[PDB]
Amino acid sequence: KFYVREPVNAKPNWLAVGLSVGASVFMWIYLIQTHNEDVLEYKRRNGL
Protein backbone atom coordinates (compact mmCIF):
# COMPACT_ATOMS: atom_id res chain seq x y z
CA LYS A 1 0.00 0.00 0.00
CA PHE A 2 2.93 2.29 0.79
CA TYR A 3 5.52 1.72 -1.95
CA VAL A 4 4.82 2.94 -5.48
CA ARG A 5 6.94 0.04 -6.74
CA GLU A 6 5.74 -2.93 -4.73
CA PRO A 7 8.73 -4.12 -2.68
CA VAL A 8 10.62 -7.08 -4.11
CA ASN A 9 10.27 -8.81 -0.72
CA ALA A 10 6.59 -8.08 -0.09
CA LYS A 11 5.85 -11.65 1.05
CA PRO A 12 8.02 -14.47 2.40
CA ASN A 13 9.44 -16.91 -0.12
CA TRP A 14 7.44 -19.74 1.42
CA LEU A 15 9.40 -22.40 -0.45
CA ALA A 16 12.65 -20.95 0.90
CA VAL A 17 11.28 -20.65 4.44
CA GLY A 18 9.98 -24.21 4.48
CA LEU A 19 13.16 -25.64 2.99
CA SER A 20 15.37 -23.71 5.43
CA VAL A 21 13.35 -24.80 8.47
CA GLY A 22 13.29 -28.39 7.25
CA ALA A 23 17.02 -28.36 6.55
CA SER A 24 17.73 -27.04 10.04
CA VAL A 25 15.49 -29.67 11.63
CA PHE A 26 17.07 -32.44 9.56
CA MET A 27 20.58 -31.20 10.37
CA TRP A 28 19.84 -31.22 14.10
CA ILE A 29 18.14 -34.63 14.06
CA TYR A 30 20.97 -36.16 12.04
CA LEU A 31 23.56 -34.55 14.31
CA ILE A 32 22.00 -35.96 17.48
CA GLN A 33 21.60 -39.41 15.92
CA THR A 34 25.22 -39.35 14.74
CA HIS A 35 26.44 -38.31 18.18
CA ASN A 36 24.51 -41.13 19.86
CA GLU A 37 25.74 -43.69 17.33
CA ASP A 38 29.33 -42.47 17.64
CA VAL A 39 29.19 -42.70 21.44
CA LEU A 40 27.78 -46.22 21.21
CA GLU A 41 30.47 -47.29 18.75
CA TYR A 42 33.23 -45.73 20.85
CA LYS A 43 32.08 -47.51 24.00
CA ARG A 44 31.68 -50.80 22.13
CA ARG A 45 35.18 -50.52 20.66
CA ASN A 46 36.80 -49.58 23.99
CA GLY A 47 34.81 -52.06 26.08
CA LEU A 48 32.78 -49.40 27.89
3 binds other proteins (CB under 8 A): yes
Query: Which residue number, 31 or 40, has a Cβ lying nearer to other proteins?
Result: 31
Query: Which residue number, 17 or 39, has a Cβ lying nearer to other proteins?
Result: 17
CA atoms within 13 Å, Cβ hemisphere of 38: 6
Query: Which residue number, 10 or 48, has a Cβ lying nearer to other proteins?
Result: 10
19 binds other proteins (CB under 8 A): no
